[PDB]
Amino acid sequence: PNNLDSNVSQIVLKKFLPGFMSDLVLAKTVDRQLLAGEINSSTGDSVSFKRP
Amino acid sequence: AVGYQLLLRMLSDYSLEPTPQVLSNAQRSYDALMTDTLVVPSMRRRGDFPVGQGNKYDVFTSDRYYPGDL
């Protein structure tokens, strides 16, 4: 018989199968401008806002 | 330190007079005690002192002047 498995090579294509996903809803809805540019790691670890 | 101070404040009760060595020892102990409790408050800025434009007082900071309080 013929034993010619050494004439071919195992090939792994350079393709990636699709994965799973999530969604961003709560982050978009809440406000980010109010706290933006207010707290820094070096300066401290707490900020305050005044109630009406 | 506490013992030497108390001895100095009690010597007059028995009508005695401290020796110079006792005084020197009490002074050294009190000096060590005062050394152990230093403060050096390190005064802060003024309050109307400007903050330089290099600090980016709008994009990165909300204050254009040093607070200098509390």
Using H for helix, E for strand and C for coil, what is the string for A2-47? Answer: CCCHHHCCCCCCCCCCCCCCCCCCHHHHCCCCCCCCCCCCCCCCCC
Contact present, B63 and B41 (Cβ < 8 Å): no
Closest B-chain CA to A41: B60
* Structure solved via: cryo-EM
Which positions in chain A touch B58 (Cβ < 8 Å)? 37
Which residues of B have a CB under 8 Å from any CB of A? 58-62
Which positions in chain A touch B61 (Cβ < 8 Å)? 37, 40
Contact present, B51 and B66 (Cβ < 8 Å): yes
Closest B-chain CA to A33: B59
What Å distances lie between residue B62 and A23, A33, A40, A47, B55, CA to CA?
A: 33, 13, 11, 12, 11
- Single out the residue of B58, B63, B69, B61 nearest to residue A39, CA to CA: B61
The resolution, in angstroms to one decimal, equals 3.7
**Is the CA virtual torsion B3, B5, B10, B16 positive or negative?**
positive
